[PDB]
Symmetry: D2
Subunit: 398 residues, 4 copies
């Protein structure tokens, strides 16, 4: 098995990296197999993970070892998540993490401000298509200096001492990095409405100055969000909580504005999905029906993620993220099978439970309530409907 062969060939520079491997790499090999990645790509991505991601994961939080930095990415405070994106034709795998610097959560680096950029730098030398210019732009506009990071830690719970996190799409051979920057620490430290600091940063992008369509699609999103998110500096929902970019050519990168909210019901789903009645086409409404039905078939906030691309003036429906923490995972798996049937993805319906068990062989998933963390649903004009399932891999292994 590739995950075992790599463990035998490579070993580990320290015990925390060994623990990370023993609690994630079998699941990851299983995910990749299940997505129909060849043996050669299983080796490619597992080798990549060993080299680049293990040292980025910091100490492995366990009984008797409590790290200085606790991530909000998972239930046990581990800075890792693995997800699958399922559409009509294929399934791809994504890793999500926070790259932990070795002074993270101490006075020299209170919000873990360096590690993700250091990982990205290493990815830029590894991969020709990786471009750090958007990272740097948003790191400049929403990052904080050390004294501001210290202030921010006095206003935030320990699991939200973060400014950025990273996702790596493992798309048929390649690694595509994306990042999300949090707006809340700067909002809190500077007492600036989140809406305002989010669009001020976006509107300073070079590509925004160059690209009329991007500007127009943003102007439409702002008209939608302005009356719905706070106008004052409050941290109350719905709120613009993250800005996302792809770490590629900025002319090709999708810019994402992610809203966090607790309140959701069928009419709110319509509101977010259609942008308050702005989108009325057959495609949009067909996706709306899908999402309504997912919500029927089925604590962290809901997520609503609006994505825009240079060259496109019109907004598309967001991706909607359902929070599944606290909800029994056997129930989630029953719901998913039912939903996959509704979609007519019969193969997915027939495999989901067996594949789930196989992904997590050392825990009885029927008894957990923290292994499924999120379910994202999206509908594309061109590419079809898509579903993104996010797992707390360490919850599924310990």
């Amino acid at each position: 098995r590739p995950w075992q062969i790599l463990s035998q060939a490579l070993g580990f520079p320290n015990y925390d990296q060994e623990l990370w491997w023993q609690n994630t790499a079998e699941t990851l090999n299983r995910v990749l197999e299940q997505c129909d990645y060849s043996v050669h790509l299983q080796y490619k991505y597992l080798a990549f993970y060993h080299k680049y991601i293990l040292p980025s994961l910091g100490p492995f939080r366990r009984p008797g070892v409590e790290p200085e930095y606790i991530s909000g990415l998972s239930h046990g405070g581990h800075p890792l998540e693995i997800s699958v994106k399922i559409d009509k034709s294929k399934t791809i795998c994504r890793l999500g993490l926070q790259a932990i610097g070795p002074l993270a959560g101490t006075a020299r680096d209170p919000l873990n401000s360096f590690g993700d950029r250091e990982l990205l730098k290493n990815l830029a030398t590894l991969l020709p298509h990786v471009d750090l210019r958007l990272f740097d732009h948003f790191n400049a506009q929403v990052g904080l200096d050390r004294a501001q990071c210290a202030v921010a830690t006095t206003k935030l719970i320990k699991e939200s001492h973060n400014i950025v996190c990273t996702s790596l799409d493992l798309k048929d051979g390649e690694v595509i990095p994306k990042v999300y920057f949090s707006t809340i620490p700067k909002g809190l430290v500077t007492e600036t409405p989140l809406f305002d600091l989010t669009f001020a940063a976006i509107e300073q992008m070079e590509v925004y100055h160059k690209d009329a369509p991007l500007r127009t699609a943003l102007s439409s999103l702002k008209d939608f969000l302005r009356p719905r998110v706070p106008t004052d500096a409050s941290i109350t929902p719905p709120l613009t909580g993250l800005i996302g970019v792809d770490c590629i050519d900025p002319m090709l990168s999708r810019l994402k504005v992610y809203l966090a909210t607790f309140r959701m019901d069928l009419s709110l789903i319509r509101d977010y999905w259609t942008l308050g009645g702005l989108l009325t086409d057959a495609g949009t409404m067909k996706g709306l029906e899908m999402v309504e039905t997912l919500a029927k078939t089925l604590r962290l906030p809901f997520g609503i993620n609006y994505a825009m691309k240079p060259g496109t003036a019109e907004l598309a429906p967001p991706q909607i993220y359902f929070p599944l923490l606290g909800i029994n995972d056997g129930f989630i798996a029953d719901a998913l099978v039912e939903f996959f049937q509704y979609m007519g993805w019969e193969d997915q319906a027939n495999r989901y439970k067996d594949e789930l068990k196989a992904k997590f062989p050392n825990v009885d998933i029927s008894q957990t309530k923290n292994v499924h963390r999120w379910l994202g649903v999206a509908y594309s004009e061109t590419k079809g409907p898509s579903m993104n399932i996010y797992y707390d891999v360490v919850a599924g292994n310990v």
Copy 2:
């Protein structure tokens, strides 16, 4: 002794680091002593230099070893210079370098795009006042992706395959980093006038949007520069070739726009110094006299305009004279004469002996390489100041 004591205590991770120490650290300790730094600051800066700078300097270019990356900072291609800033009351030391990444000058990193930031990151964890937000801003607006870097290396000589360089001011007990971003690679690759890509980047800064006085000073500067630098995408001097920032709180950082040109004569000096007749005060003119006299007593010339948030009015630039190719004994004689003109008699009396002490392995009467630049400035607050830049490796062999 502090340089030797640190060498004995610490040793070296590899031979290139040992060669860098053996060819720079004695001079550096000498510079620090001569600026009246206490023994405790000598250990401070030298320990700092050993830990942070030696690994950033890359391979030590020498007979038989030709690095993949060659720096234009020095005559032998070594990415290092040491300078002193002399004013009425004190002398401070500064290090200038390019932090070399381990894949610099290869297909994975053609313009050495990563090393300086990696060094700055480690400084940010070392030093509470170090703020990387202005770095990241300009790296975003003037940096290039890998394919663009590769294109840029086909249009530029080996010694200009750079996007950024770093200075570290060793000022009282602190280290203050500054960086300069080059505009030429992005100008060449994108065919964008250097003037436009420079002010477009500056005008996207958050502090520019927040600060009315800064926006006023910049409009004055753009009025001055627009008719003087190219309006098309040519790399035709005079031109806006670097943007500089201090890696501190952006409300306190000085923004610098640096012009490069190969023509200088009295009429041009006056034009640059006074901003085309805008500055006419007794201060400005007392400085202009200095500069004219320096040029008489005596690589492109440099002209560096500096702006600070909160200040609407422009000051005279710093002007940089290239000294490469000119005998260093002559330079030292000229400087002694100039220091006499200034009435800095102490400096005049010490300069030649302190120079010899800085560089014991060379004889300055025979080199033309060791003095590389002379910067002269004047400000109303602080007085006249002079910056002398040395090729430390040239002075040591």
Copy 3:
């Protein structure tokens, strides 16, 4: 100041290193000052400590963080002690530690078998006089393979999962390393009497084969020890529990055989001190008086016999009294009284104030942990000497 200056200049690669500095380096600078080391040696040793020792110390055991490897060197399980060696004329400082590998105490490295050698290797490139041949010799003869290590951890408490430990004498301007190899793990795992595996290892040394006097001194020692330590494979005290060497030129290295025992009384002290009546001279007896008086004025006891190539005659051992569990204010009162007995009046006058200065964060009148060992020795050449070992972390919290 030197400890603070180095902290400002260097910072820290990770938080465990920063915690080690914050809990040891001020005391260490205090010890060095008190031994009259010049400022330049203070920077020397402290810079050395920062670079070589901090990364060797592993994670800093603290509430919420429990390392996979726990050292028996200190009460809290930290692999560090600092000691002073006081004689008539001078006081020198020494560091004792276990260099922790990153997989120490896990299946890949159960007895921490690699870290000390890795540190010694880096010292050998740092220091021309450091010679690893005696290390490698004893590591070969008393070290264990992985399966044997795993067996040994099933037979030994967590705090005795070790094969070697290292001392660094900070003597004049140099660093002199020494190591001690434990015989017990190989004794337990192979069921070989400790006496036999100790002398078998020693008798295979090249210097033993080359040097007649050494072979004579060792035969005398074996005669003394054979009837006193176990002839079977028991771990029954008194026993030969460590072999020590200096990591220098094997012709100059002192070989040490260390006995551990839990019984001591006047008749045993005399028996160990005089080698069962072999040494009867005025020197030996003046030392025995010292030792008896120290025991009166006041973990196994230790008895350390030292031999040198070129010397056929045995000297009195160094005797180590365990002080764990005994009030440190009392210990300090006892030492002042003892130093008076010795006529070292300066030491008597400074001891309690210098102690307080070494450990400002604790109150010694209330701790029982800070003094860990007292070693006493006498030699005809050099006089009496006393070695006091402190749990530096206990003294700092």
Copy 4:
């Protein structure tokens, strides 16, 4: 292809490691394929090579970069060799190298005294069967201090500034390390006959003191060597130039005494092979015939390597190493095919030339004279005849 996939997944920490990969890893993948290693073992050994061996190879000597340390392992001064061991039933691959420390060939480490041990330490944490006790023993007895290493560099050519080298047998899944220690530097510095310093070190081994059979087989080898190698301190052939051990349990490790000599002819081959007429059995004579015929079918010295094992009192025939540097490689390949025919290994005969070309796709091997470096031949009582072919991999690639 595994070597390419690993290059894509992993990249390189510096340019010298990248150059090492680009000039060795394709050949290595090709060797492993040709030895019938599965895809999973190709990944295992290539991943191992990337992690452990690349950083050990030091700077890649090339036009414009002349390292401080030059290895005598290859023609261009590169510290690497790859070999194949061919017997009746199978072929296995071995790597040979010198692990270069970062101060090697400078005043702080004149004979590269540290790097091999540092690599071995890392192998001991990677692999449970690795045992460093013999390494340490011989490092103690024949190693030199820094002042002695400096003296030795004044008496030795630059390519012989070495005290140890390492071989890694890639035997069906496992890595088995062996080392060879040079006796010449200590011989030169101390003015001690090589014979005497070699057997003095061996006779201090713990296993020698414990094992009557080992002692007896050594006593027989010494009776053979004493009248044939120098009695004074001269460095003249035949001489005992290396001591080899396996870095495993010392009760299982074969101890090797390697002789270097320039003069060889059929009667010398008999002398070495039979230990001066001591070995007269049918097996020995059948192997002698083989070796005579190899010599007929067919500058560095010849090697004669006597191997002994605890528990065995009787000596076996040595392995005899023919130096092939300077000899056209197309000629060597013709000779090998002819020899393989003589042996009746017809498959090897039919493949050798095509496989050779395929191992070295970027150089025309018919035109080189430095790619084959050594040919070792051995005959085993139990395991049969064996042939070891050593290649200068960098010579075959640049």
